[PDB]
Amino acid sequence: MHVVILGSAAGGGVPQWNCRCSICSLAWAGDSRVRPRTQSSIAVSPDGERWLLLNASPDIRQQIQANPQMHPREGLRHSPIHAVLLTNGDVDHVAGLLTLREGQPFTLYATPGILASVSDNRVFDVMAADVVKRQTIALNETFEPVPGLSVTLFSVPTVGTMIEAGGKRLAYIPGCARVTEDLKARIAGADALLFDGTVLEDDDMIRAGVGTKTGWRMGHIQMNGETGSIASLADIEIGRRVFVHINNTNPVLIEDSYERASVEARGWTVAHDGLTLDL
């Protein structure tokens, strides 16, 4: 299975357009210690030519350009993107759909609620009805949007996505409020886990001076602590642990930081845009 992480940041990206926290400020200055990041999205393929897009972020046009895997093939309307899956209806998950409009056939997958919400916005009609097939999917239902690629959505404490091809398994869970034994049982054995890395400490955004809400308040389990994701996930088998959906206020974004080293020392990769996996 081929994986490309198109966007590794949480909503707002890195930097965020109206943020001047210490991390974003480094990015604005073009300091090498902080790599700019687009908003969460990954692409997965069973064969390396036909791809499923997971969520369509506001940065999708930049993501397609930056990643050769996404570049159109020779001829008319010949994109490697065959399907798009929406895991939720948030603006940072659907705004990219407005870019995918120029008569390109693909299949859009989502739950009935999300598809209905999209259809309730006429601006998304740029995905022409005679061009883009809109297909409802149920939770816990396995389907095959690309031949050889099995996809299943499942609830998490909000949905996670289980992707399977050629005996390999990837769990994609960019948003997670808490790690349960139930969740761990689902993840265990996966060749790769891409997991909510929004905040390092519960009070990241407060310390950064950009907000008053804790990670808990916003539905994001923090990385650190006995109750954190790293500790909670440490005793199950996972081929590759990767943090995605990283907020601009997270100090793991700083390339030479102790925090980054600490998270890597505990077996976690901090994702950057264009990171690839061949499982």
Added chain:
Amino acid sequence: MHVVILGSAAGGGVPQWNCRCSICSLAWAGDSRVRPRTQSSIAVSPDGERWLLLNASPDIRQQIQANPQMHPREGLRHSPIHAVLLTNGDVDHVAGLLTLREGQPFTLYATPGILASVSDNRVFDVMAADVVKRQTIALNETFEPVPGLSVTLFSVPGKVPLWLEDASMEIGAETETTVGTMIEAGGKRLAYIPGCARVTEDLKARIAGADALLFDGTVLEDDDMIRAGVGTKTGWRMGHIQMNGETGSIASLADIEIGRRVFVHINNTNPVLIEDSYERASVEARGWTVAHDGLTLDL
């Protein structure tokens, strides 16, 4: 007056995500003959610190990053973007609004028809009502969205946006649906008309005397997209007067006085995008600049 062209391409940008025409292919390969471009948007300021955004493209986050003028200032929620004005309801002009959502105060300006069309989409509620003021402006009404910067809206012949197209489609008519903008600060005048189906004597009267004109450069010939092999739609069909011909924009605008002529909103299929093309040389010889991203004007 400070002007920065944030995006100089038409809808789709250059390259377009699903296009492999000869121009886009050069861009995909990183060939120097074609500079990559983001979608139509410019920013204007009377003082260089407080800015009005004209249109909000799908590339707006990249445009803000690439242009230091747009970078947020020290402190909390401190952006140089004070206001946004929409010239029409096309996706390449409004999609960027979804990015401007994180509690940042500004005023969104548009004609009543365009604002209503936008507001009818609940996805744009991410511009919170207690944060973003939505202010309608009438045709021919002058307003001042940034101190020292006067803006006037006026109707231009256009086409209704693709996502609002219908069986009795409007093409070339003058309504609240498509506007050009006259921008003035410190005695200098800028005309910004990224979309225009045809040039009227009335429009020429509006433009005449302007220090700069930034104008619809979507297609060189009516059949650009056909010649490029990417589509069947004519320039007329898409609501864009072509550059060339006795009836084209270059000829139509040649006999009025303009300090600086600049083409924006250029489609990926337009050969003026090719740096060394005869076509590019031809339009420059007739007094026109072909805009690129990050192009600045200090009027």
